[PDB]
């Protein structure tokens, strides 16, 4: 991926890249240049790297680019954007298959990864994920742990959980709020103030 | 293809390739035909375009430029000792520079 993006950045167009792969013998055989480029698609008749022309347009475009529960998450999101809070979520619910699910979700890291206005409007649901920092399906009985930079799973502890955030090494000012929800069976919010 | 234009490098290249000779014979040829004192030059079948860089070949007597695409005769101003000249099979339309 890095090599294809490198060639995308090297040549102003794959027009020019496939023109470079076009030798003069195709030029005085075909007597055309765009038709020669469409011939020099792939190594089919050239030394062109496996990047489609439309894929080049997409890749250079990508380089150029580069319920009280919803209200509670709204204030938590505004505090997260202010940057004086790191927050996590306890979810108890059932999935589409119906198994009972308990999740410990990195709310601020999930906010940074994807936008949550869809979650506030209800088109998407905050569900326990293996990519989340702790995941536990009660019928599956598998505990999945993630080492997010927002919250770190410990190597070992006997007594209680210790989740660490990199700036404050708190493995400090944690407020606990449990709220009744309609879609979810139980929802708890843990707020660690920065 | 590209018609390259005639210079001292291929002049000494032809001086090299005209005679294989031996080692003492090569030293003898070094004493005999210096770049000032080349007795004969043969540059045929190279696709010569324009005559150039013949200033150093002062004592040149025989010059051969056949089977090429020379269009204008020039650059022979310093071959005052030239006796034999071949400009055959070229694109020369006007006689000049002699």
């Amino acid at each position: 991926l890095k090599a294809l993006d490198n060639i995308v950045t090297q040549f102003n167009a794959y027009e020019d890249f496939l023109d470079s792969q076009i030798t003069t013998v195709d030029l005085y055989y075909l007597e055309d240049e765009t038709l020669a480029r469409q011939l020099v698609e792939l190594g089919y008749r050239g030394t062109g790297e496996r990047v489609k022309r439309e894929d080049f347009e997409a890749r250079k475009a990508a380089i150029e680019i580069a319920d009280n529960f919803l209200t509670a998450l709204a204030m938590r999101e505004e505090d997260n954007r202010s940057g004086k809070l790191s927050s996590v979520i306890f979810i108890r619910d059932r999935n589409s298959h119906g198994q009972e699910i308990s999740g410990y979700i990195d709310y601020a890291h999930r906010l940074k990864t994807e936008d949550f206005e869809v979650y506030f409007t209800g088109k998407k649901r905050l569900l326990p994920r293996p990519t989340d920092i702790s995941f536990y399906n009660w019928d599956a009985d598998i505990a999945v742990s993630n080492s997010s930079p927002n919250y770190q799973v410990i190597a070992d502890n006997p007594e209680g959980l210790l989740f660490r955030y990199k700036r404050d090494r708190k493995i400090d000012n944690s407020t606990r709020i449990t709220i009744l929800t309609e879609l979810y069976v139980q929802a708890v919010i843990f707020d660690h103030i920065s | 293809m590209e018609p390259r234009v005639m210079d001292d490098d291929m002049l000494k290249l032809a001086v090299g390739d005209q005679g294989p000779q031996e080692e003492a014979g090569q030293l003898a040829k070094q004493e005999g035909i210096l770049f000032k004192d080349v007795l004969s030059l043969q540059l045929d079948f190279r696709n010569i375009l324009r005559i150039d860089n013949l200033w150093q070949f002062e004592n040149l007597r025989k010059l051969q430029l056949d089977n090429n695409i020379i269009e204008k005769i020039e650059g022979l101003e310093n071959l005052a000792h030239l006796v034999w000249l071949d400009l055959s099979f070229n694109n020369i339309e006007t006689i000049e520079g002699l």
């Binding site: 007597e31 240049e33 | 234009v5 210079d7 375009l49 324009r50 150039d52």
Partner: protein
């Protein structure tokens, strides 16, 4: 349209041909005004010798 595209690439081919053709003439023309320079200076060195 196909004609106009055909003369474009044909003249681009002859353009490359005459491009390297008398572009190499001009570079060795700079070398021939240079051989005029060096021949004049060598003749001057010879006559002051």
């Amino acid at each position: 349209i196909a004609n106009l595209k055909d003369q474009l690439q044909e003249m681009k081919a002859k353009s490359n041909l005459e491009n390297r053709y008398m572009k190499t003439n001009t570079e060795l023309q700079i070398a021939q005004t240079q051989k005029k320079c060096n021949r004049t200076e060598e003749l001057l060195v010879e006559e002051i010798e």
